[PDB]
Amino acid sequence: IVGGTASVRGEWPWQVTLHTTSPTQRHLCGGSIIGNQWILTAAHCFYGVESPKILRVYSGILNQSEIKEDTSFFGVQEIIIHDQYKMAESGYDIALLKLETTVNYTDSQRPISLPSKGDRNVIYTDCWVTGWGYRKLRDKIQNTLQKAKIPLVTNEECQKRYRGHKITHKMICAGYREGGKDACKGDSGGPLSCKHNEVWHLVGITSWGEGCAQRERPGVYTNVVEYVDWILEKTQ
Numbered sequence: 001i002v003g004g005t006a007s008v009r010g011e012w013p014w015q016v017t018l019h020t021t022s023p024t025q026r027h028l029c030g031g032s033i034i035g036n037q038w039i040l041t042a043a044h045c046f047y048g049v050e051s052p053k054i055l056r057v058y059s060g061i062l063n064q065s066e067i068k069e070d071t072s073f074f075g076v077q078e079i080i081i082h083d084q085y086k087m088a089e090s091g092y093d094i095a096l097l098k099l100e101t102t103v104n105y106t107d108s109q110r111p112i113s114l115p116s117k118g119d120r121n122v123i124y125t126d127c128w129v130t131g132w133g134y135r136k137l138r139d140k141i142q143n144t145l146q147k148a149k150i151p152l153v154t155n156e157e158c159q160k161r162y163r164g165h166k167i168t169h170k171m172i173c174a175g176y177r178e179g180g181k182d183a184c185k186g187d188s189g190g191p192l193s194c195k196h197n198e199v200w201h202l203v204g205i206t207s208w209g210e211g212c213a214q215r216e217r218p219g220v221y222t223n224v225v226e227y228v229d230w231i232l233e234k235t236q
């Protein structure tokens, strides 16, 4: 996250850190808890991932430095990538991880609600992006989970900013006209979380953007509402 601030423990309980362990352990991407056995993340996170065997899901993490060799993690049974997925920028940037066990929900591990039936035309004005990504181009993964509030921009506006890409109704964009606050490399797969009637909803999945916090270049997110039928198909 660019232009963000540190979170405090327990603040974003659906946030997970997805680690790879090949060739060595490191944070690969964010994700969100959407069910007891289910994490929603981005398809592009899996590019160099040989199989589910090398992955580890950590919940309840504030600082990456907390994760030690005795820190409990959830194994991944299955990575379900959308059948039409090809590359982040061409859309369908959505994956489910089916975990090897069911999370017992606690204060530090909670689900985030999908966008609700009946809420398709709701205007979300309290959206937040979270993760351990870069604070600049050519940075590193950050220790403390970062947060930044970011306004949604219309698809029309987003297309005018990305005239070399096909922005579709299955994407949603978010950013300030002057930049300064944005998601970045390593925030991939984490939530764009929006609070409506005091209930949080997973509105976006961090996907791609041109640079990070560059002016007039918003973040482009997977528009979760348009995949709710696909999610429910795979999770039932």
Ligand SMILES: CC(C)C[C@@H](NC1CCCCC1)C(=O)N1CC(F)(F)C[C@H]1C(=O)NCc1ccc2c(N)nccc2c1
Residues within 6 Å of the ligand: 044, 087, 088, 089, 137, 182, 183, 184, 185, 186, 187, 188, 206, 207, 208, 209, 210, 211, 212, 213, 218, 219, 220
């Ligand atoms: C060629 C470009 C059109 C896209 C390209 N630009 C990044 C910028 C940072 C250094 C690495 C390359 C891009 O995003 N990605 C390349 C890819 F498809 F392999 C994966 C994807 C990526 O890095 N996802 C993370 C990301 C980056 C910038 C973001 C951002 N600025 N806002 C919200 C969300 C943002 C999320």
